[PDB]
Structure formats: C-alpha cells, structure tokens
Design an enzyme around this catalytic site. Structure first.
Site, short mmCIF file in Angstrom:
data_model
loop_
_atom_site.label_atom_id
_atom_site.label_comp_id
_atom_site.label_asym_id
_atom_site.label_seq_id
_atom_site.Cartn_x
_atom_site.Cartn_y
_atom_site.Cartn_z
N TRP A 122 29.76 -47.41 43.70
CA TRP A 122 30.00 -46.06 43.21
C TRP A 122 28.69 -45.32 43.48
CZ3 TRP A 122 29.04 -43.85 37.84
CH2 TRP A 122 29.91 -42.77 37.55
N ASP A 203 29.53 -52.82 34.69
CA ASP A 203 30.10 -51.48 34.64
C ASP A 203 31.60 -51.71 34.43
OD1 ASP A 203 30.97 -48.84 35.08
OD2 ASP A 203 29.92 -48.61 36.97
N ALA A 205 34.68 -49.72 33.70
CA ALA A 205 35.29 -48.40 33.61
C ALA A 205 36.81 -48.43 33.72
CB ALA A 205 34.72 -47.48 34.68
N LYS A 238 39.02 -43.28 31.87
CA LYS A 238 40.23 -43.62 32.58
C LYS A 238 41.33 -44.29 31.77
CE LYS A 238 36.95 -43.09 36.00
NZ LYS A 238 35.79 -43.79 36.57
C1 LIG Z 1 34.57 -43.71 36.00
C2 LIG Z 1 33.50 -44.54 36.33
C3 LIG Z 1 32.34 -44.52 35.54
C4 LIG Z 1 32.15 -43.56 34.35
O1 LIG Z 1 32.89 -42.37 34.26
P1 LIG Z 1 32.65 -41.46 33.03
O2 LIG Z 1 33.50 -40.18 33.34
O3 LIG Z 1 31.20 -41.13 32.98
O4 LIG Z 1 33.31 -42.10 31.88
C5 LIG Z 1 31.33 -45.36 35.83
N1 LIG Z 1 31.43 -46.23 36.85
C6 LIG Z 1 32.51 -46.28 37.64
C7 LIG Z 1 32.56 -47.29 38.80
C8 LIG Z 1 33.56 -45.44 37.40
O5 LIG Z 1 34.62 -45.48 38.26
#
Ligand SMILES: *Cc1c(COP(=O)(O)O)cnc(C)c1O
Ligand SMILES: *Cc1c(COP(=O)(O)O)cnc(C)c1O
Lengths: 389, 394
Positions: A122, A203, A205, A238
């Site tokens: 990311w 991480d 998410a 999400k």
């Molecule tokens: C969505 C996501 C996040 C964090 O998203 P926030 O809108 O800040 O909650 C962090 N890492 C990854 C890989 C994501 O896809």
C-alpha cells in the site's frame, strides 16, 4: 514564508473526461454493491439511532479511547489470545493514524530502526515512512508470473532483518496484490521473526473480507502467540463501512505488565501531542455494534453476504477467463482473497485496455472485483484475453 | 524493544481530579474543570447540535471516503464564521483537522516546512499544550510577557518590548480571544499596535481561536483576528469547534492559511492536504458535518447563536456577582478585574501556597496557577469563594 513551500486522483479526472458510455471504474478503493453504491450497514445505522438517543453529553472523554472500544477491538482481533494484562490499546484516527502512531511508538523505542515492506505494498505505507525519514527496505512477496506469493524470496529477504527492525505484514487480503499467506507460511514467518528478533507490525484493514471474521485473524493470532512483542494497526473503515468516521486502533502486545504501562503511557502521549483526544463517533458505533448481541449478529450476517458476494464474482471472472483462454492460466483470480487483485499486466497493457475498452484500473493493474458485475465480467475478460495478458 | 521506552508523564489535572474525588468533605467545590458546566453541573449537548445529528441520520446515504482537506461546505462556513465578509477565498487555504489541537499541530508542521529555522513566541503564560507540542517537535520557544501579576491585566508595554525582538520568519502565537488560562484580553487598539509590530518584524502570526463567542460575542471575539488578517498578508488561524459548539469529543477544528497571492495559496493547500494524508489520511467527518449543518441551516444557526448567547451572558452575570461579592467583603475594588476578564477562565493571581491554603481550609479546588472556571460557580458557591479568597490574604 509560505511561498518557500514545495509543490507537495488524476486518473479520476481522466475517467470523468471519458465521454464513452461503458466506462468501467475498477480502480476504486472502496466496496461497492450491485448498483455502484457504498451503503451504510444496517447495524451501523441502528447503532447511530441508538446513540443519538442515549448520549447526554459530548465532553472530553478518554485520551487513549474508550475502554469499551479498546476491549471490543482487542477481542475482535485476538479472540481468546487477548492477554489484556500485557496489551496496550490506543484509539486512533483510522487505520492510517494507527500505522503512523505505530511508527512513532517504535521509533521512540529505537531511533535506529529500519522498516521492511512487501514488494509491492500500500503506497501510503512508504509515503508516511519517507515523510518520517525512516529507512525502508523491501522483501519479495508478489510473484509476477504465477500471480501468487514468492514465499522462497520472502523467507530469503526477511532472514536478513536485524534485531529491533520492523517487518510490516498485511494480516489478510493483501492490498494491492490479493495474494495471501497460508497458515503454514505464517508459521514459518513466525520462526524467522523469532530468530531475528524483528518486531512485527501487522496491518489488519480487511478482517472479514477474505474467508471470514475469525479465519482472517488466524495469521495474526498465531504471530501473537509465538512472538512476545508485536504491534497491530487495525481499521474499522472497510469492515464496518465507516470510512469517513476515521475509526482505527493500535494494539501493542508486550512481554510483561511493566512494558505494557510504558507503551500505554507513550501511546497516550503520542495522541496528546498530535491532536489530543481521538474522534469518538465512529469508535462508539463500533463498540455498540460489537457489545450488543442482536447488532453484532446482523453486522456479521451482512459482512458475510458482502464477502460471499465477492467470491461469487471472482469465480465467475476466473471461469469466463478460462473459457476464453481454453486454460486455467487465470486461476489465480479465484484463489486471491479480498477486494483487490493484481492482474499482473504491464503498464502498456493497462493503458491499452483503458484506451481501447474503457476499463480503468490502477497503473500496477490492480482491480477492485467489487467494482465488477456479471455484465462487466465478460467485457473485462475479452479485454484481458485480447490485450494478451 | 518496547522496554527502553522512557516513562511518559500523565495529564496535568488528572492527579488533582483524583485528589478532589478522595476528599470526604461535604460541600467541596471544583473550579479546575476545563469545560463548560451548566447550573446543574452538566455539559449538555446544544439543541441545534442534537437537531443537526438527527438530520444527518435521516439524510446520509453513504460513509465512503470524502475530502482529504475536509468538506467544501465546512471549509466555507468556518471561513465565513471567523473572517466575516472579509474572507478573500482566492487567497485562503483551509484544512479540517482533528480539533483545534490538531489545527495547531498542523500549523507548526506547515510553518516548519516553509522555514526550518523558525522560533515560536508564546505568551507568558499560555495553554500548557502549546509548549508540550513545540517541545515534542523540538521547536525553539521564546516567551513574551503577557499577564501582569499585580493588576491581573495585560502587561502591554512588556508584550510590545518582547515581541519587538521577533525576527523575520519567527512565529508569534496569539490567542484570538478569551486568553486561557488568564482571561485577560487585548483591546482592539492593542491588536492594532500588535499589527504594527508584526508588519515591522515580518514574523508570522498564528492565531489560536478556540472560544469565539464566549467573550463579548460571536462577531466581537473575532475582531482581533480580522484586524490582523486585513493588515498582515500572511496569517495562520487555528480554530476549534469543541467549546462554542459543545462537541469536545467529536474532534472538530480548522486551520486557515491566509496568503499574499493565489499561487502561494495553491502551495499551502497542497502542503496542508499532504500533512493530513501522512498523519491519518482523511479527517473525521461527524463533527465537521454537524457544524456545517448548523451554520448553513437558517433555523439551526439561529437557535445555536441564541444558546451560545445565553451561555455567554450567564457567565458574565456570574463574573459580576463574584466581583460584587468581592467588593462588599474587601471594602475595595482590587478584584474589579474579575468583571473585566472575558472567557470561561480567570487567573486570580494567588500564589501556590495560597492556592493550597484555599483547598485545605475551604475545600475549594482550582488549578495550581490559581485558574478558576467561572462556569463552575453559582449563587451558593460564590459567597464561599469570595470569603476564601479574602481569608487567605489574596
Ligand atoms: C484501508 C487501509 C488502511 C487504513 O485505512 P483507514 O481509512 O485509515 O482506516 C491501512 N492499510 C491498508 C492496506 C488499507 O487497505
Ligand atoms: C480548547 C483549546 C484548544 C483546542 O481544543 P480542541 O479540544 O483540540 O478542540 C486549543 N487552544 C486552546 C487555548 C484551547 O483552550
């Protein structure tokens, strides 16, 4: 002095500029339903109605977040492995704020740390690291040709991690690749980390978008059971569909109660120095849903329907592709887990698909399968096969 | 590695809060609180705020990611609420932040980006968080005299003398109104002199505006900020909606960057958005949406202003009552400054020894610097506070 500032999305405008009916936006980074909408989950709406009726004040609350939120999130993620006597919890501004706070926390404990990230990862991960001036290193992950994981390469690179270094791992549903580690791979990873003394940063998410709420936390729970010290940045954006509320959580798993106190104090301090208290609303929605039986039951049901829906969609893509190719070359599509998938196509092929078929993906060929549709599937498959991927 | 994490000090009043709680005395009083409290000792949710949330519940259809710099509706409404009709939209960059504290943090990061050699000047005294943040960032901090301990008013001559030392590129932090913790404020004419010194030195003013509407009025409390804004080409404004909207925990603030030209506005806006992205990505929507709903909805804005006014006037009558009581008992007007101070807080000027003497003998609690919260007083508490003040020889 503001004039001394350097010049610190474009595809969207380009997409908007396209007059061709049949424009397909597969580059989106949020969930979308059959009719291209990101609805508010039933439980979330019910939780807000309840909140508006029971909250009698909006005075300053807890600097590290509310205890009900901290406990609920700790249990959601760690399940039975939740050792609260050695776990520090910090409510943050979304998952990104969680990662940021994680970096600051670790850096305070080790001004000399380096961070290992997957190839690819990311992009917001690296930008924050660069902005912080943190040394970034990569480890092989996505196998371009098989479109799966290059576990041998990953093991090779990670073995060189030093003591005190940090290894950023996606808990599940790898963004952007879609390729994920198996429990066997996770176990071998834990061995490497244990041998090197490298601190793991998970991480998480997308818990709930791969194989299920409990199943998606398996790898995380295993790392937590093998390694005495681990950091985990979770997002509720999400899986609760509250992207704009900015609800996230940072968990610091420590070897003992003493270190837990140090961490918790430094975490709270970090919030205080950045923006003081964390946003209450989104976090309140989350804890209400999680602690209210009928609400959690429905949130699970809905999330499972979303999850199952996406699998159904990518199985059709895999099938449609296999038929038009006469082989199961694109089998990886049905094997990937999550919202995104990298087609493994070149920048040339990517733009050729855009300009010729009107399908918009991210430059690295990342597609959001939720942005697909049984009508869109055949068209996408034609594009892929025709452009010769 | 988390074991070599140095111990971090707790929250300032946190300890005092625990001390207060342990006190077994019937009739103890807490004036150290840092939030508004009504007659019944509560911090209610404003009527327009409750009504706005109800509206949002029925009209919101999605919760997808919105604007990285905040919503346009909020940005416009905040700019207008602060700068009135003088809002030159062409040259102002706006950023929704996580409270006023977040706006302050972002302003310091922005300025530091534009000038890595900057020094900040803070009033003596100032909101502790100011110094903590700057210390955390490793920013050089200078002080300028402000509170006159004997008169409890502003030592303007001292302030002018110290600010005259600010170089070009230095940052001067001024409270737009209702100085926390003192309650002592600048007159519009004193702001005008301040403008002269800032123009002369070329120092960047950073206005911390957290209590607009708690002093003399919504428009009145912004006069100082507006004067600076009209005479100085480059201004930074850190506003908070916590207190005037009563949404403390929703974390709603705003950072406005007034620039000399449009080109620079672009540079600032881009850097500001960049700052949000690298810290927590998108800013929190809930509070900002309540605020923009209240401000843009005729009936709501009307009801909100009406409630704020009732609050402001109420606190003022309290100040009058205290001062009157102090006058009757002292047989003098030494405490007249109480009725002259504006805001929720007031520094009484008692020494630490006197402050503890007040606690031990009269069971009254206040911050160690003698900062009291006017909203914590009332018809029953006032007489005791007055007697306490006098008995301890303040
Ligand atoms: C969505 C996501 C996040 C964090 O998203 P926030 O809108 O800040 O909650 C962090 N890492 C990854 C890989 C994501 O896809
Ligand atoms: C309250 C306050 C702030 C900001 O508070 P937030 O809770 O972060 O909105 C900033 N400065 C001063 C002087 C304040 O009193």
């Amino acid at each position: 002095m503001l004039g001394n500032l350097k010049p610190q999305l474009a595809l969207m405008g380009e997409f908007r500029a396209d007059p061709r009916q049949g424009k397909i936006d597969l580059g989106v980074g949020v969930y979308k339903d059959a009719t291209g909408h990101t609805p508010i989950m039933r439980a979330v709406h019910a939780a807000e109605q309840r909140m508006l009726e029971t909250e009698t004040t909006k005075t300053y609350a807890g600097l590290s977040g509310e205890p009900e939120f901290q406990k609920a999130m700790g249990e959601l993620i760690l399940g039975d492995g939740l050792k609260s006597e050695t776990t520090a919890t910090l409510a943050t501004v979304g998952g990104t704020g969680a990662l940021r706070q994680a970096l600051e926390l670790a850096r305070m404990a080790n001004p000399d740390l380096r961070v290992f990230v997957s190839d690819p990862t990311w992009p917001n991960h690296v930008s924050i690291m660069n902005f912080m001036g943190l040394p970034v290193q990569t480890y092989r992950y996505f196998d371009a040709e098989t479109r799966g994981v290059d576990f041998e390469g990953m093991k090779a690179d990670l073995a060189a991690a030093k003591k005190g270094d940090m290894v950023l791992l996606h808990g599940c549903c790898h963004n952007p690749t879609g390729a994920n580690l198996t429990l066997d791979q996770w176990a071998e990873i834990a061995s490497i980390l244990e041998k090197t003394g490298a601190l793991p940063l998970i991480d998480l998410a997308y818990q709930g978008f791969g194989d299920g709420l409990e199943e998606d936390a398996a790898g995380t729970r295993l790392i937590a059971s093998r390694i005495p010290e681990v950091l985990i940045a979770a997002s509720c954006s999400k899986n609760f569909g509250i992207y704009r509320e900015r609800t996230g959580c940072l968990l610091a798993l420590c070897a003992d109660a003493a270190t837990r106190e140090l961490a918790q104090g430094a975490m709270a301090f970090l919030n205080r120095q950045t923006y003081s208290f964390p946003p209450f609303h989104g976090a309140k929605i989350v804890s209400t849903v999680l602690t209210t039986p009928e609400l959690r039951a429905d949130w699970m049901a809905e999330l499972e329907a979303v999850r199952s829906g996406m699998l159904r969609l990518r199985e059709q893509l895999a099938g449609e592709l296999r038929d038009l190719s006469g082989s199961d070359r694109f089998g990886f599509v049905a094997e990937h887990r999550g919202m995104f998938s990298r087609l493994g196509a070149t920048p040339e092929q990517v733009k050729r698909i855009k300009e010729e078929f009107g399908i918009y993906m991210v430059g690295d060929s990342r597609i959001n399968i939720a942005g697909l549709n049984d009508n869109t599937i055949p068209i996408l498959a034609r594009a892929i096969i025709e452009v010769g991927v």
